[PDB]
Amino acid sequence: SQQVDKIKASYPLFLDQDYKDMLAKKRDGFEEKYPQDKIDEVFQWTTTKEYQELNFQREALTVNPAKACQPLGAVLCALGFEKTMPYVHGSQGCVAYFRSYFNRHFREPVSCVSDSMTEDAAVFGGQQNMKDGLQNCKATYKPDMIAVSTTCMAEVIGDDLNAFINNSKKEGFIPDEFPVPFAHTPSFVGSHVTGWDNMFEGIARYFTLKSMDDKVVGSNKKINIVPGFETYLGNFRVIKRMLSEMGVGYSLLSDPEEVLDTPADGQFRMYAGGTTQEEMKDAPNALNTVLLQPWHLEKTKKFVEGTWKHEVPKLNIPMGLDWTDEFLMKVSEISGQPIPASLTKERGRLVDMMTDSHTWLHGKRFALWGDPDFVMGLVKFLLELGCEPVHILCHNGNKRWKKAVDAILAASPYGKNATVYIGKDLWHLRSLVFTDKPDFMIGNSYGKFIQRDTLHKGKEFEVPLIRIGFPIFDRHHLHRSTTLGYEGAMQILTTLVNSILERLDEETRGMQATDYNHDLVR
Amino acid sequence: SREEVESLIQEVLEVYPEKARKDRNKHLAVNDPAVTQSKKCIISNKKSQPGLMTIRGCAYAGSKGVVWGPIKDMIHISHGPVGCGQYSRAGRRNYYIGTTGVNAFVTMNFTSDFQEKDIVFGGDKKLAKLIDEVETLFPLNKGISVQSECPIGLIGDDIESVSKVKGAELSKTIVPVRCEGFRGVSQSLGHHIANDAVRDWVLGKRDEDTTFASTPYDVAIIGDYNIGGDAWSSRILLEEMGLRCVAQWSGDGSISEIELTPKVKLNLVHCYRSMNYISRHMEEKYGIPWMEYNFFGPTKTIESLRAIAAKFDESIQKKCEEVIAKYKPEWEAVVAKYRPRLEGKRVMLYIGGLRPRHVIGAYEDLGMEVVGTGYEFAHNDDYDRTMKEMGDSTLLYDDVTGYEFEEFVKRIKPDLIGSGIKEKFIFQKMGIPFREMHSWDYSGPYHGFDGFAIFARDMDMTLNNPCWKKLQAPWE
Amino acid sequence: AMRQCAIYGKGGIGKSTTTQNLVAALAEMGKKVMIVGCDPKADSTRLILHSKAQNTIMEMAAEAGTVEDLELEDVLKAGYGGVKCVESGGPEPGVGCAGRGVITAINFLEEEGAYEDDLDFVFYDVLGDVVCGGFAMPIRENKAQEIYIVCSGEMMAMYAANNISKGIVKYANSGSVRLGGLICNSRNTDREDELIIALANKLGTQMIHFVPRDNVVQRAEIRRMTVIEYDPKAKQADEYRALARKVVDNKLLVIPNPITMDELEELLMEFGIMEVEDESIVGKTA
Amino acid sequence: AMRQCAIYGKGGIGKSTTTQNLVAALAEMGKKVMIVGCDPKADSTRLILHSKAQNTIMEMAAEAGTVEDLELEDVLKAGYGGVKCVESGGPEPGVGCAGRGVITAINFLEEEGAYEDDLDFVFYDVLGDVVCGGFAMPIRENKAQEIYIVCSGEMMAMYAANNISKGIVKYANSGSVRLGGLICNSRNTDREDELIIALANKLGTQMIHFVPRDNVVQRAEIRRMTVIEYDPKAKQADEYRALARKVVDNKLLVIPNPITMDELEELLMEFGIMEVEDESIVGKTAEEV
Numbered sequence A: 001s002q003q004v005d006k007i008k009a010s011y012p013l014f015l016d017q018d019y020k021d022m023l024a025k026k027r028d029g030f031e032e033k034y035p036q037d038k039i040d041e042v043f044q045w046t047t048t049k050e051y052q053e054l055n056f057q058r059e060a061l062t063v064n065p066a067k068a069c070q071p072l073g074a075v076l077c078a079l080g081f082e083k084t085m086p087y088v089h090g091s092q093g094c095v096a097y098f099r100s101y102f103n104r105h106f107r108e109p110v111s112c113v114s115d116s117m118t119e120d121a122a123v124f125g126g127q128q129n130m131k132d133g134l135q136n137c138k139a140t141y142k143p144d145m146i147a148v149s150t151t152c153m154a155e156v157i158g159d160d161l162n163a164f165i166n167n168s169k170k171e172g173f174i175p176d177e178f179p180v181p182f183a184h185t186p187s188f189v190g191s192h193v194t195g196w197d198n199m200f201e202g203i204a205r206y207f208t209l210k211s212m213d214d215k216v217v218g219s220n221k222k223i224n225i226v227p228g229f230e231t232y233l234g235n236f237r238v239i240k241r242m243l244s245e246m247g248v249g250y251s252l253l254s255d256p257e258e259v260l261d262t263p264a265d266g267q268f269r270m271y272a273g274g275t276t277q278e279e280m281k282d283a284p285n286a287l288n289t290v291l292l293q294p295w296h297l298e299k300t301k302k303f304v305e306g307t308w309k310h311e312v313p314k315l316n317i318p319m320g321l322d323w324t325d326e327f328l329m330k331v332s333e334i335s336g337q338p339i340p341a342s343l344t345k346e347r348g349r350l351v352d353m354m355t356d357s358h359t360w361l362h363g364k365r366f367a368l369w370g371d372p373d374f375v376m377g378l379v380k381f382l383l384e385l386g387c388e389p390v391h392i393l394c395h396n397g398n399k400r401w402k403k404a405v406d407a408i409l410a411a412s413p414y415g416k417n418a419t420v421y422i423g424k425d426l427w428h429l430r431s432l433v434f435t436d437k438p439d440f441m442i443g444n445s446y447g448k449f450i451q452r453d454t455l456h457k458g459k460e461f462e463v464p465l466i467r468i469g470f471p472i473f474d475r476h477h478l479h480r481s482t483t484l485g486y487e488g489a490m491q492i493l494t495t496l497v498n499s500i501l502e503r504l505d506e507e508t509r510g511m512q513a514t515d516y517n518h519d520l521v522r
Numbered sequence B: 001s002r003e004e005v006e007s008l009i010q011e012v013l014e015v016y017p018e019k020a021r022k023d024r025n026k027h028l029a030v031n032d033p034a035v036t037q038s039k040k041c042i043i044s045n046k047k048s049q050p051g052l053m054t055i056r057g058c059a060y061a062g063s064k065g066v067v068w069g070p071i072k073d074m075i076h077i078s079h080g081p082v083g084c085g086q087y088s089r090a091g092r093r094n095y096y097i098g099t100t101g102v103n104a105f106v107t108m109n110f111t112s113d114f115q116e117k118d119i120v121f122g123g124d125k126k127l128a129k130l131i132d133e134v135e136t137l138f139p140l141n142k143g144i145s146v147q148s149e150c151p152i153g154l155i156g157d158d159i160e161s162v163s164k165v166k167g168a169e170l171s172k173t174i175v176p177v178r179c180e181g182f183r184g185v186s187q188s189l190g191h192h193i194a195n196d197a198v199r200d201w202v203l204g205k206r207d208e209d210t211t212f213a214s215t216p217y218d219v220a221i222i223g224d225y226n227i228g229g230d231a232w233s234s235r236i237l238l239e240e241m242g243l244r245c246v247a248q249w250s251g252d253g254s255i256s257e258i259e260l261t262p263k264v265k266l267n268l269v270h271c272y273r274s275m276n277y278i279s280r281h282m283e284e285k286y287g288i289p290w291m292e293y294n295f296f297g298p299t300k301t302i303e304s305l306r307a308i309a310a311k312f313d314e315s316i317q318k319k320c321e322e323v324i325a326k327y328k329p330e331w332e333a334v335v336a337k338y339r340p341r342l343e344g345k346r347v348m349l350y351i352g353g354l355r356p357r358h359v360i361g362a363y364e365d366l367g368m369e370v371v372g373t374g375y376e377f378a379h380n381d382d383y384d385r386t387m388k389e390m391g392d393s394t395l396l397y398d399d400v401t402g403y404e405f406e407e408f409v410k411r412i413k414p415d416l417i418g419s420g421i422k423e424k425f426i427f428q429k430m431g432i433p434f435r436e437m438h439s440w441d442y443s444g445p446y447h448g449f450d451g452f453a454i455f456a457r458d459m460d461m462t463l464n465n466p467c468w469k470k471l472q473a474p475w476e
Numbered sequence C: 001a002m003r004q005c006a007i008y009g010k011g012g013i014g015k016s017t018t019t020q021n022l023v024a025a026l027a028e029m030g031k032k033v034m035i036v037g038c039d040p041k042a043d044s045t046r047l048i049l050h051s052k053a054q055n056t057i058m059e060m061a062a063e064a065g066t067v068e069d070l071e072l073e074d075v076l077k078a079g080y081g082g083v084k085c086v087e088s089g090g091p092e093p094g095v096g097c098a099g100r101g102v103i104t105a106i107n108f109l110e111e112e113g114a115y116e117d118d119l120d121f122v123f124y125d126v127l128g129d130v131v132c133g134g135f136a137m138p139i140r141e142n143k144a145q146e147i148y149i150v151c152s153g154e155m156m157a158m159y160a161a162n163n164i165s166k167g168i169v170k171y172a173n174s175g176s177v178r179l180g181g182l183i184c185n186s187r188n189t190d191r192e193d194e195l196i197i198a199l200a201n202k203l204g205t206q207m208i209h210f211v212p213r214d215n216v217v218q219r220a221e222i223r224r225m226t227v228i229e230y231d232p233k234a235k236q237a238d239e240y241r242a243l244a245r246k247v248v249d250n251k252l253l254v255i256p257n258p259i260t261m262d263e264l265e266e267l268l269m270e271f272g273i274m275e276v277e278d279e280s281i282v283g284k285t286a
Numbered sequence D: 001a002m003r004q005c006a007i008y009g010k011g012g013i014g015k016s017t018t019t020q021n022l023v024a025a026l027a028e029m030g031k032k033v034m035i036v037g038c039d040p041k042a043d044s045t046r047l048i049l050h051s052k053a054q055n056t057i058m059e060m061a062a063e064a065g066t067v068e069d070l071e072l073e074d075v076l077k078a079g080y081g082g083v084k085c086v087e088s089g090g091p092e093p094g095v096g097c098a099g100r101g102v103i104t105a106i107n108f109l110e111e112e113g114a115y116e117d118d119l120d121f122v123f124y125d126v127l128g129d130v131v132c133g134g135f136a137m138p139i140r141e142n143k144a145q146e147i148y149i150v151c152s153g154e155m156m157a158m159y160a161a162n163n164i165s166k167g168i169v170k171y172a173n174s175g176s177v178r179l180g181g182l183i184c185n186s187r188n189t190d191r192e193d194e195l196i197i198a199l200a201n202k203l204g205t206q207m208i209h210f211v212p213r214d215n216v217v218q219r220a221e222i223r224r225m226t227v228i229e230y231d232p233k234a235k236q237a238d239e240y241r242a243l244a245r246k247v248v249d250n251k252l253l254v255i256p257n258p259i260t261m262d263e264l265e266e267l268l269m270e271f272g273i274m275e276v277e278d279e280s281i282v283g284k285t286a287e288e289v
C-alpha cells in the first residue's frame, strides 16, 4: 500500500509488514535457503586469517577486479581530440558498455561507434565492417577524425587494422586524406590504461612518423603535456592553469575537458574543444614532452624519446607537495620561466593546511587502490601528511612499479607498516581490512560493498570508504574535483581530515554515552 | 500528420550512404493501429549497420546481465578477459534479499580475467582450477554458471566438457552458456541462448522428484527481473488474490525456485521477449499453460488480475475483486494528484524488448500520450503486439541510430523522453525532461499498484521540474 | 643506443648457427647482447650456453597461474661472452598460435626489466618458413627495427626471403621496421654469391655477407659451441667477425621491393639453379 | 561413405608429388577423389591439372571483397582421372593465418555441395613444418580423420613427423582423428626404410610404404603430371599403386605415442646418422683439447 502524500520507493516500502511477511514466505517455501546460523558461521569464517590465506593462493579465479579493459582507455584518449569520433572495430556490445561506464561517472553523453562485427565476421574477419563503418560514421556524425581501436574478438581473429583502413581508402569508402589513426587494444593484455597508451602512441605516430625530417626540437617554444587516462576534470584544468600562470607555452595532447563538460543550454554538442590535429603535427617541434602518468605511458615514451628526440624528464605524477614542487621546477628549467609568486604562495597555503590538520591525520591507517600513478601519488601525499598507507592495492600494477613504490615507502618512517600488492583484487583487499583493520579505505565506488561487509561483522569493525578514484557512480559531480598539484593536495587533505572528523562525530553522538567527546571545536 | 511523419523519416535518411539508407528505411515507420502483421510496416531483429551508433548491447549482456545474473544463490563467471564483467557489475538493479559474498552473489564480479597466455593455450584448465577456487571460497553457492565472453568460442575452448567433468566431480550444477558477444545481433539471442541453457542443464533436475506438495493455485512469475523491486510489488498482489507464487524468473530468484517451476499450474509471463522460449518449452514438456500479463498502471494491472483469476475457480475470482477494491482508492488518489499535472503531455520512448509497449497504459492513466516508441532488439511478434497499443500516425523506430533519435526528437518535440543511460544526458542538454526507463532512474518499483504511485510521482517531478525553465541565459 | 634486430629465414639452412656466431662475435668485440629465440624448435641459444635445451618461457608459463609467476632468473641465462639468452618457445602442437606465443614471451621480458640500459644489441631469432600474420607479429609490434634475412642460393630459401620482404612492406607505411640486408648461408651451390647479390639488388637491399660452408662449424657444434668460442683462430671465425662489423656499421635500412614468381624463376634460371621449361611436352606421355 | 584423409609432412621432401601421385593411383583405380591444397609453398594440384599454378580461393576471394561471390568452377577444377582440385591459398605474407585460410575453403566447398558423398576420398595436403593451431585446423574441425605423414630418413623430416603426431594426440580424445601411417619418401639413404620403420614402431603406427627415388618422377614433373599418367608402365607407377592399395585397405588407425627429443636423437645415433657427443669435451675450446 501507499499513502499518496508520502509515497515510498523500494526503501522503505519493502520494510512494511505485509511485504516483510511475503518475503519470509517466499524464502521458507521455495528458496531452500541455508539456515541463518550457517550463513553467520561462513560469514565469520570469511573474515579470518585462515580464509585470507586460502584467498591469497587463488591462481585462476578473480573476484571484484579493480581494473577494466584496453579499449575503454582508447576511447577516453580519442575523446580528447578535436571533432574526433572514437571507433572500436569489433563487437558492438563492448561499445554499449564503454559509453554507459563513462556516462555514469561523468553524468554526460559519451559518443563512440562500433562496426558491429558479428558471427559471419568471426570466420573471415571484419574488413567489410571497416569499409562500411568508416563511411557511415563519417557521413552520419561528421567527425574530422576517426580514431580506431579494437575489441577482443577482432584481436583474436587477427584483423589487420592497417590493411583494413588502407583498403577502405583505396576503394573510396573514406577520403584518402581523412585522418584515421589506429591502435590494436587487446583486452587480454594489461588494462584500460594500456589502451590509453596504445591509442595515444597510435595517434602520435599517425601525425608525425613520416614527416620527422621537417621537425626541429624546441622550435615552437612549447612544452607538450600528455595526461594519460584521467577522469577528474579538475586535473586537466589545474595543469593548464598552473602553466598559464607561469607564462609557459604548452600543448595538452588529448584534452577531453570541454567534451566531458558541455553546458545544458538547449543544444547537444557531440564534439567540443580538444587537442587539434595541427597540435599533434607540431608536437615534435616542442622543447620537450612531459608525461603526467609515466607508469601507463611507456609505449608513448619510447616513441617520444626515440622518434621526436625529446629528453622526457623523469618525473613522478604531480601529486602531493614534493612531486608538485618537482614538476614546477622541471617545467621552469625547460621553459626558462621562473615559478611566480602566486604559485609559491599557493604552495605555502597547502603547507599551512598540513600544519593545521596534522594532529587528526597523524598515524591514521589506510587501505587504498586504483591505477599505478594515482596510487603512488596518493601514497606519497599520505606519507607527507604523517599517515600510514597500510594496504596498497594496484590490480593492474607491475613488478617494476611495485619496486618504485617500495622505495618511496622505505624513504619514510610512515611507510613501515605498508605492503604493496599487485595482481590482487577487491576480494583480496576485503580480507586485508578484516585481518589487519585500517581506519579508512580510499577507493572507488566498488569499495562500498567492502564497507557494508565490515559493518556486518560489527560497528566497531566498520571501515568507512572515502571516494577518490574511478569510477565513482554513487555520488554526484565528484568528477569535477582535482587530485593533481597543490590544489588537488588541498582537496584531498580536506576530504581526508573531514572524513576522520565525520566518523569521530558519529562515534561520539551517543547521548550520555559517548557524547562527552562530542566537541563543538576540533 | 501521417504525411509529416513520412516526410520526417525521408528527410532524416538523406544523410546516409546508399546501403545504410535503404536498410534504415525498413526500420522506421508511421503507426497504423489497424495493422496486425507488423512486417507489412517495419522490419526488426536484423544486424545493426556498422558505424551508426546503435544503442544495442550483446548476447553476453542478454544472458549474463539479464537472465542469469539475477539468480542470487548461484555464482556466475564472466568467462574471458576482464572487460565484460566489470562494465556489467551491479549496473542493473535486479533486486534480491541475501547475504552477499556468503549465500548470495549478485553484485559481485567473478571472472577468469584472461591474459595473453590464456588466449594462446586456451582457458579450459584455468576454468577447472577457477571452479575449485570458487568451491573453496564460496562453499554456500548452490550452483555455478559460465558466461562465455567473445574469445571462448573463437579459440575453441570446450566449456561443456569442463562443466560436465567438474559437475560430476563436485556433485554440483555447473552451466556452460555460449553467450559470446559475436553471436546474434543484440541482447536478444542472449535471452534465447540463456533459456536453452536453463532448459538443458537445470530445469529437469526434479523431473522424477515428487516431494513438492503442490496446490491448484501454484503459479510462477516468468520474466520479471525485479528492477527496483518490481517483482515483489507484483508478487504481493497475486498472493493477496489467493495464488501461490512458487518461483520468480529471475529477479530475486533462487536455483531451487527454478527447479520447482515445472510443478506449477500456470506460468505468468510478463517479459514475453526474454522468456517466451522457456515458457513454450514448459507447456510442451510439462503441459503447463502460460499467459501474458501487464502490471504497468491500474488499468493494465486490474485487467491482468481479472484475466489471471479467470483461469482459476470462483474463490480466486472473488479474492481478485476484493484486491481490486482494496487498492482502488489508492491509485485513484495518485491519479487525482498527478494527472492534472501531466494531462496532455507527450512522451517519446525507446527501450529494449517489452517496456516500449508495456508502459503505454500507465502513461495514459495519467492522461499522457505516447507519440513515439521503439525497441533496441524486439522481434516482429513484439511489434505485432505494439501497433494496436499506439495511436494512429505515431512514430515507430527499430534499432534507432543516435542520429535518428536526435533528429526525430528535434522535430516531434516531446514533453518527456523515456530511454536509457546512453540517451539521458543528450536530451537533458536539449532542455527535454528525461526519465530512465530501464533503471527507473534509481527509483521504483513501477509494477503494480504500489509501483504506480512511484511512477506518477517520478514523471511529475521531472517533467515539471523548475530546472527546465532555466536553460537560456537571460542576456540571450 | 640499443639496436633491435631480428634474424628471419627459412629453416634447415643454418640460420640459428649463423645468428649465434654473429652474436658471439659481437660479444667478443665488446658489445652487450641479448638473444631472444622465437623459433618453436627453441634452438637459438644452445651454442652460447653449451646446453642441450633451454627452458622456454612458453613451457614455464603453461605450468603457472599467471606469467608474472615466472622469474627472469629461470628464463634469462648468461652464456659465452656474457651474452644473455632467452627462448620464447611455442604453445603445444596443434593448439596455439605460435606467433602470439612469441609476443607473450617478449612482452614478459619487457615488463620484467630484461632489457637493461646497458644492452647494445638484442637479436630475435625468428622462423621465416611460412610468413603468416603470427610470425610477422614482431614486425607489426615494432619489436625489432632491423631485419636481416638469412637465405641460400636455392628456391625455397629465396622464396622465404621474398615473403619476409613482403611482410616488411605490409607494415612499412605505418612503422619504422626495415630490411637491412640478406645474409647468404652458402650451400656451396656454384654461382651462389652472385645469385643472392642479384636478388638483393632486385629487392633493393644488399647481401651484407656471404657465410661460406666450413666444417669447423660442425666440429664446434658437436661441443655445443660457436666457432668464435671454440676456435677464434679459425678462418670461419673471421667470417663471422666480418658479418658482425658490417651489421654494426650498417646504415642501409630499406623498404624492399618484392619480386614476382616469374621474376624469381627467371633469376633461378639465369644461374642454372632452375632450367627453362619446354612447354611443348607439358602434358605428354609415350 | 567418404574417407577424409590428410597428408602432413615438412616442406622440401617431395610430399606434394607423393600426394598427387597417390591420388592419381586411386583414380586410375576408380575412386572419386578431391584434393584440397593447404600448402602455401607447394602447389598440390599442379600435376593433376597439368597447370603451372592453380588459382586459389584466398587469391580469387580478393577479387570480390568476399568469398560469397566465387563460383565452384572457378575454384574446383578437375584433372587426370577426374580428381577435383582446389587450392586454399596460403596466408597473405605478414597478415594472414593459414588456419583461417583453410576454414575458408572448407565452407565454400561444403556450401557449393562439392563436399558430398559422391566422393570416395578427400585428401587435404597440408604443410607440417610448424604444427600450430592454424595448420591443424583440418584436424581441429574434424575434417581430416585419417592422417598419413610423409617423411624422410633425416632429423627435420622425422622431428616434424613427431610434431604432427603430437597434434593428432591433442585432438584424438575430442574426435575421430587418427594416424594411418608413415610414408617414407626415399632420399637414397642407407637403411632409410629400417629407420622409418623403427620410427613407426615407436610412434605406435606403421610405415605404410617406402617411395623410391626414381628419375621418371622428375621426368613426369617437368611435364606437369604424375608418373601414373606420364608412364603407367613405369616401375615407379606400381609403387604408387601399392601405396594407394594399402591406404584403401588400411585398417590401422591409431592414437600415436610421440617420443622425446632424447629418444629421437638416440634413434638417429643408433643408425649412425647423428654423431655421438663426447660430453667430457662439451664447452671446451680447441686449444684445451
Ligand code: CLF
Residues within 6 Å of the ligand: A069, A070, A071, A091, A092, A093, A094, A095, A097, A150, A151, A152, A153, A187, B058, B059, B060, B061, B081, B082, B083, B084, B085, B148, B149, B150, B179, B180, B181, B182
Ligand atoms: S561483445 Fe564481447 S561478450 Fe559482449 S561486452 Fe564485448 S567483450 Fe564482452 Fe569487449 S568489453 Fe573488453 S573488448 Fe572484450 S573484454 Fe569485454
Ligand code: SF4
Residues within 6 Å of the ligand: C096, C097, C098, C099, C100, C132, C133, C134, C135, D096, D097, D098, D099, D100, D132, D133, D134, D135
Ligand atoms: S597466424 Fe601463423 S602461427 Fe598463428 S595460428 Fe595462424 S598459421 Fe599458426
Ligand SMILES: [Ca+2]
Residues within 6 Å of the ligand: A106, A107, A108, B425
Ligand atoms: Ca552532466
Ligand code: NA
Residues within 6 Å of the ligand: A045
Ligand atoms: Na568452513
